[PDB]
Amino acid sequence: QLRSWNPPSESVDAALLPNFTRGNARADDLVRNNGYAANAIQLHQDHIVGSFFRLSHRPSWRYLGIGEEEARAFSREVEAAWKEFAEDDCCCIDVERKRTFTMMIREGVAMHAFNGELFVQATWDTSSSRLFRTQFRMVSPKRISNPNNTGDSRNCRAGVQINDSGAALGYYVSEDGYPGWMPQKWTWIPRELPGGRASFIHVFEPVEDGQTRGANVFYSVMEQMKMLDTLQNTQLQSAIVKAMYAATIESELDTQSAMDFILGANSQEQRERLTGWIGEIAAYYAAAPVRLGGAKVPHLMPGDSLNLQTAQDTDNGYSVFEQSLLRYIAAGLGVSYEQLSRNYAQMSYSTARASANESWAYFMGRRKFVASRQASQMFLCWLEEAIVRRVVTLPSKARFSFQEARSAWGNCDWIGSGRMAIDGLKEVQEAVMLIEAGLSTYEKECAKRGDDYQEIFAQQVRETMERRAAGLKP
């Protein structure tokens, strides 16, 4: 079985890139034919981004000498601008003109999960319906190959032109293949502009040094493919052969030496004996009507029957095989099957909350690992455009210029899915302890709750004043 799937013995990058197309193609096959990939990407979406992905700008006020109040007001301005620019209802923020920021993050994270890499391009849109002429078009991974599909070279390696030190200079984007009859032409695309401008945002997780591509799926999913095939076929055979039945006719006849002599005489010159016996047996079956049930017994003149003696008859064991292996690959691939297909077998209280909190912290890990890159890159490009357009005003006491301290000025964090609910009592006792001991700040409280302290305080002011005015109890 190791024949149809073969690992070379070498560093992972040189063991994957030669068989990149086959592994990725069979990955496409399984993610299309199989529901597990859809469920996994959907849960990753709903744990990492969830409803939305919220920007929070925190310029390094302490290091830059900027006042915290000026930083906070400038952040208010940039947050209002960014939310109003992102909430465009006409899907107009993409060059394809059919994806908002939500689906920017969606397709980016999905493709960085599947192929391990995502490709964003900051292009200059001309549609004047918005103040900001920068859109972000996502680039397929099929596009990145060496110019004219040539094999890897000295410095042109699977489509990326690098130096001897590996520094990613640029890329050869092959032309799109949709419809299925466009030819591919390779075009030069630099990774970033010299001034720090993020033109081609290439975010991938390298497992080792010098690696150019991300992680796969199929190269650990062939075994589900062939287990589902084998369980499927074995259930089919079991079902079809629980009551397969042979309906033949035998007789006494069979006078050993006499039967053999009759057969030999028929073979030599006395076939009339066989013809007469066949006629008698045909008359037998047409005067009997030899019929078993609703159907006719298949015509068998005496002396021939099937021997449907069977193989071993122990239990198939597939039960504990499949539970063990589903277990196995479930906290292999990472998301547990007791919800990837939802068993409720013997699961208990500590079971539930321990599994939930470890899995949720681990999704927080993946979120902070493979979402903040895209978030910061897009925010940096948008903030550069805003500074170009003088939408928001930089602090006058800027210790470093915007172009010099884009990292310092464009320092930001992002908020993923909403408020976690698992037990209730858990979150509420945590909340009461934090609010009584002061062990929670504005920033981490809002991180835990998916809200904002400024708005909760303003709305509590509104709550109290409306209760006082209408006669309610604050």
Write out the residues near other proteins by the rule CB under 8 A: 22, 150-154
Q: Which residue from 185, 187, 296, 327 is in contact with a copy of itself, where contact means CB under 8 A?
A: 327
* R_g of the chain computed on alpha carbons: 35
Q: Does the protein bind a copy of itself through residue 272 (CB under 8 A)?
A: yes
From 149, 267, 393, 401, residue interacting with a copy of itself (rule: CB under 8 A): 267
Alpha-carbon gap, residue 472 to 464, rounded angstroms: 9
Nearer to a copy of itself, 12 or 388 (CB): 12
Least gap, CB of 205 to a copy of itself (angstroms): 8
Q: Which of residues 29-48 bind a copy of itself (CB under 8 A)?
A: 29, 31-36, 38-39, 42-43, 45-46
CB of 449 to a copy of itself, least distance (A): 7
The vertex-203 CA angle with 381 and 35, nearest 5°, equals: 120
Work out how close the CB of 151 gets to other proteins at its nearest, in angstroms, rounded to a whole number. Answer: 5
Output the CA torsion 466→76→92→106 (10° steps).
Answer: -90
Per partner kind, with CB cut-offs from 5 to 8 A, the member of other proteins, a copy of itself, none near residue 432 is a copy of itself
In the complex with other proteins, which residue's Cβ is closer, 154 or 242?
Answer: 154
Helices (H), 95-159: 101-114
329 touches a copy of itself (CB under 8 A)? yes
Minimum distance, C-beta of residue 260 to a copy of itself, in the bound complex (Å) = 4
Q: Own/partner pairs for 464-467, CB < 8 Å, 24+ apart?
A: none
Residues 403-422 that bind a copy of itself (CB under 8 A): 404, 406-408, 410-411, 418, 421-422
456 makes contact with a copy of itself (CB under 8 A)? yes
d(CA 189, CA 200): 7
In 3D space, the residue among 461, 360, 455, 466 whose CA is nearest the CA of residue 416 turns out to be 360
Does 187 help bind a copy of itself (rule: CB under 8 A)?
Answer: no
Q: Is residue 88 a contact partner of residue 81, using CB atoms and an 8 Å limit?
A: no
Between residues 17 and 333, which has the closer beta carbon with respect to other proteins? 17
Pairing of strands 160-162, 156-157: antiparallel
Task: Look up residue 471 and give its two tokens.
Answer: 């006669």
* Tokens of residue 292, six digits: 């078993």
Site membership for a copy of itself, residue 182 (CB under 8 A):
yes
* 126 touching a copy of itself, by CB under 8 A: no
Binding site partner of 236, from other proteins, a copy of itself, none, Cβ cut-off 5-8 A by kind: a copy of itself
Residues 6+ apart with CB under 8 A from 167: none
Residue 354 CA to residue 362 CA, distance in Å, equals 12
Task: Give the x/- contact pattern for a copy of itself in 222-261, rule: CB under 8 A.
Answer: -x------xxxxxxxxxxxxxxxxxxxxxxxxxxxxxxxx
Min dist CB 444 to other proteins, Å, is 53
Site for a copy of itself, residues 331 to 370, rule: CB under 8 A: 331-334, 336-358, 361-362, 364-365, 368
Residue of 409, 413, 63, 381 lying closest to 195 (CA atoms): 381
Query: Please, which residue, 153 or 233, has the CB nearer to other proteins?
Result: 153
- Cα–Cα distances in Å, from 98 out to 84, 122, 162? 18, 16, 33
Interface size with a copy of itself, residues (CB under 8 A): 247
What part of residues 79-108 is at the interface with a copy of itself (CB under 8 A)? 80-81, 83-84, 87-90, 95-99, 103, 107
Binding at 150: pick from other proteins, a copy of itself, none (beta carbon under 5-8 Å per type): other proteins
Site string for a copy of itself, 43-72 (x = CB under 8 A): x-xx---xx--------x-xx---------
Give the CA distances from residue 442 to residues 429, 436, 438, in Å, rounded to whole numbers and listed in that order. Answer: 18, 14, 10
Token readout for 257 is 């030496």
* Residue nearer to other proteins on the CB measure, 135 or 212: 212
Q: Cα–Cα distance between 172 and 158 in angstroms, integer? A: 9
